[PDB]
């Protein structure tokens, strides 16, 4: 039996379909039989008879499907047509400031993607704006910063691997940037210190250990991160930073046939492979799971190249099926309940043109029908986002239609004079910055309790996942008073897009010019 | 069928077949590479013209041999197909004395030794003219009324043509005719004109084993075969040897009612053979055949047994028999406690059902030990080895082995039956092929013969100088006069057979039989328990 | 590295289990195999045959009733031993008999095989050849060459204490007057010669003895059988039968 | 005979069952015969026909069972289905403090485990609170600490290997942490100095030598462990420190067939193997032996992976049998007398769900019955702790039900006016902080001798394991007086959980608000 690619599997099997199936204790490779394998829940593999690794990453077609492989490659990447490679970005948990009266705020970071969008990781941190201290109005004064002073920046970060394969020795160099181009610092690539592993969906260091301190705390530079006044001003007006990271990972862990040992070979290095993967696969970005950008690459054919025409034709439907988890309970593509029709398709200009052609030779207008007839070619970039939410320039979930917001609140488990304990779907509370509470006199007056832009963070989360809104937090540590059991109690929610991050022109602090959505309205009797 | 065939032929799927359907793979594996070349011939075997073309093709090669045939050769070949029945006028003219008048008024129909055809023969013989001296003259007469049948002599003697079991003149005649026939078959089948040639022969199951032949055919519908007995027949049928002259056909022809075996025999270019004008071939004697498969087939609404076979040098099969001889002797010398090198279970077989005889030894003895008190076996085996006696399993008639003829010394003293015990040689003989007219299986035949030996040793221990049995002692003859007729009619014959019959029954595998002997002959039971005590 | 695994792997992995009792039969048969067959035919021709018991050799019908006094035996190395513990005894009489206790360790170890071969050599020298007085001048000549030789520990290896004290060279009369000692020396040499691992020791310390036994087992044992057969009347008569028949 | 995994043992043998058995002096491998091997007390091994090492650690299926292996690997790990790997944690024996009049206290450490528990070793020290010196009330003053001062920390530590395999060259880096995230110091990884071996259940340096001094005593840093005042305050209120250690061990010792030499191969390093083990085995934690957390890993099947389905099915009962020593005298699982029913089973949320399923397809509710029918899958975490003791958040033994405490004392070997000499079960005296002694007037009065919160450590242990309570220790070096031969003498015991570690609000030192259990009460004449 011929086998040109020298990858264990014979040619015909690779072209037509095969599957590995365990017979009591021995595993053997078999040609796909329609009737005996389908009942057993086995996947029909296909691959290239002329490629030692159809995806082009460092694991052979045979190794992947057979399980002889670094046991850390994520499961969904075991299928021969899904490239397995790392994607490391940096997540900053909190910062602190002073001058070479310590501004200590918690931060939230999200992996970003913007638009002709290219293969380079960047993240984006947002510093909390809410006033942890009552008296700390205006940062410029809480820290004695003068026109001729300089502030020091000291943050905590952890690395997150959201890819599909482990990195071993190296940790990426990564540069912090404020504004458009003001590079404050480049985080050194520590040497011979990352002897641990970053498996997919893991943190370094783990959630159980102190996070890696950004400032060295040693003698390398007394304050490496100096920062002039004007810069500090820029930061105060924008409250946003960027973290750009490159692709310099370590070596690769390979499987040895003589004894099954996985040793990090010093010859193979990810910086030689990534270009290959990136130039021969179609890339699909999905924010379905938890509104975070998950990126996968599928091996598609490229007409111009002989060796490349060898790869099995890949239709979009299958791509979604094998890369993310879509299935067919009733033949309708859906991801854990949500039908495929609730998602957007966005394409780069190239891919757009190509798909318009494909839709023309078939005489169809709605791609959601002819979904299983769209051929993927190499280098297409596709963005599938939930259709219900509003988005900003960096494709981060930022808001939503008010009506959806209301349905998300229609389940009042209990109500009293001390607050609400709701049970809301975990995804909505990442596009709500806070709530405005107000009381209405029986004759139409309006009293807003937390009537300051930076006093909205009143919604905490209990250990049983029930959100609890506390009135006494930014009140006077006093219960909630009502001048009339007929006075209505109104609760409003403020979406991210409509929030204010700095005092206005004339330093207005009132919540007047804020687009507010009605979220609750029960009279005194109900409470 | 088609599906399995397809998966097996396609190289890449063969392994899948073997993994999920092991048995199917084995069947198809054996099917497509030897039997397949077979079934083609039978298809051709249905067309008249193919039969006639191959027959004619076979003719010319033997044309030269046929054209040179003399009168003596053809006359001999004539005698071989049709036996010559004995002529009454010759025997009558051969007696002429007082014995014939004496014979005149004898209770003919009272001799068990005679068979039906011999009773008929004597009854019509009496157109030319009891517990005494007349059955001995009848014993002699039996050795003179047998038909002149060369082929019968050849299986009965197993190829040992010098057997002094018959009158000397007949012996010279037989040796001469067979040697002349041996000279006649000088042409080998070998040619450049033809490859594998298959020939056929229809055979009656009763010729190989009358024990299986009685229940082979379904009791209700004679067109079906009972699968249970079939599996037994097939179990250990692995090789066979033909010592006599095979009379084979060329084209399959319909068989008679009593022929249920349809042999397909392949030949070797070196096998010597003769051509017959009547579409038959005469093969040389002393041919060895290995059986490749045994199956049930259907033809014209009736069931049959298909048996194939391949001709090979007899020596190759003979080696199997000696190695079997060594395996059984080494195993039982250890199991009994006998000297390491003893020749005890020697068996010599030259017939069609050989392999079953050998394998059946490994069963008769297993049933023999587990059923008899260990100390009796050991003691009697010790007695037997103290002399030159050996057990002997054969597939030829008992009168031709070696030991039996020598010690009796009279020509007429010959006896043939299912089993036999020779005191002079202290040997037990078990003839497998025949079926006991009484016994249910072979094991019982063995135990019966064993009884005669035990009786001899038991009698030997009482006094060393005198040779006598436990019976003949006045303390047992009387016992035979009272209870002797309370069991089977066969044992009523005399004391020796009675003792043997009682011994098997007291040791039968069915406890019910034991109880029967308990409640029917209470005295004998304590007597037997008293002779076996001597240990 | 992959090469070595194979040999150790094979030595350790018994593919199938022979069985609980088969091993015993296979062990004994392999042991008796190494002795030249012609010795076995000579033994059978003179009568009794070797039977392998399984239990305590001290209690067997053939030996319990005879030679009760000789409970003291000396192994090949000269150390005493009691018959019950010993794993092989033999007896010379009207019925020459040899009894061996079955065990599973005759192929694996060697010290037990040496005692068995020693007993076969003792049967050979005392019971077979003695009927023809085969040990004679050639054997005496090698024997004599061993006593007088440069610091040859060979004596220590084959001679008992009784021999180391005969001052002069060996004499043909002595063998006649004393015939147990010489037959013993013969047996020892025979034993050391058959066992592969001890063969080298023999040739090393008693060269002439090794040469003698080598030519003896090589081409001087068929003559033993033929000459023994020349005593049997029936052998002579079968011989006449065959010769007269063929050329008749 | 085929043999794909190339591990010496043939396929059929590995799948069906085999065993190694020494025949007088030669060792041979045999297929398991049920009747002839069982009487000899031989174990029935099973393994994977497609894995050179079923556990996935660096010793072949063949090497483990045959004994050709580093003779240091612990016995329980010789069985082919139990992973052999190291588990190193740091034990601190005592500390000392001063200012850049030195408080030198002995400490006790316990290897910890807390809850969603992850694969990283950490320990926890507790500093003795009892007053060694009478006059040393309030640490803040015994050391002349000022608002603008800094204290120096100097401790002694030893490394403990509680795993099942040896480490060779390296010794792990480990960082001390006070509070939630305040890292005081990271103990350097000394270089080319741990040339000795840490066999399982051993200390480095051995118990017979001085422990490795934490402070260098050289010129590297004058006081590496600086610590601001506020830090010192947290420490004074809590007396707890955490020791987090990572997994950077050395190389691996391999067996050479040519000469039987065990050489440390510089290519293979435990930091490449541990991930494999950690992703393909079920982990069982047991505190049965001496109330210490012993962790073992057993090789279990993982349905999703072909090669992995090859491993023998593992039932919980057998796992406990082969990993820890449980046996069946009468068919009832037990560990040295204690029936299996005296233990709790706690499971991580995943494993919990999975086992609930397993209990559903069998229609049973009490797992203690159906124990031999529970299948183990990869990645389960199971925690088996003694049911009789109360536990804290870090699963350390901390208390117990009063009835057990009283029953543990019903054997009074001797009683006099100078103290008790008891013989108690070695495990209980690890949850008792001390005893309060009091004398009772014939009319109900109450006089507590050692009436101070920090005066409880009065129970010593004699060299024959007999506990001796000394009254004169925290008395006035005077015997015990009794105002009436009819007066009862009462003794109470205080378990750790109910102890106080700092003076109260108004600095109360009296044992008033302490939950005390009566342990003894004999009249004056019954002594």
Author numbering:
A (entry chain B), D (entry chain C): 175 to 274, 287 to 301, 323 to 734
B (entry chain H): 217 to 345, 368 to 773
C (entry chain I): 32 to 279
What does the paper say about this structure?
During the early and late steps of infection with the Gram-positive bacterium B. anthracis, the tripartite anthrax toxin is secreted as major virulence factor in order to kill host immune cells such as macrophages or neutrophils.
We then determined the structure of the PA7LF3 pre-pore complex by single particle cryo-EM to an average resolution of 3.5 Å. However, in this initial 3D reconstruction the densities corresponding to LF represented a mixture of assemblies and were partly unassignable. This can be either due to the symmetry mismatch that emerges when three lethal factors bind simultaneously to PA7 or to possible different conformations of the individual LFs bound to PA7. The densities corresponding to the lethal factors in the 4.3 Å structure were not resolved well enough to allow the fitting of an atomic model (S2F). Therefore, we proceeded with the remaining two structures, combined the two particle stacks and masked out the density of the third LF to improve the resolution of the rest of the complex to 3.5 Å (S2H). The structures reveal that PA7 forms a seven-fold symmetric ring structure with a ~25 Å wide central opening. Noteworthy, the 2β2-2β3 loop region (residues 300–323) which is implicated in pore formation was not resolved in our map. The LF-PA interface is well resolved for all LFs and almost identical in the different structures.
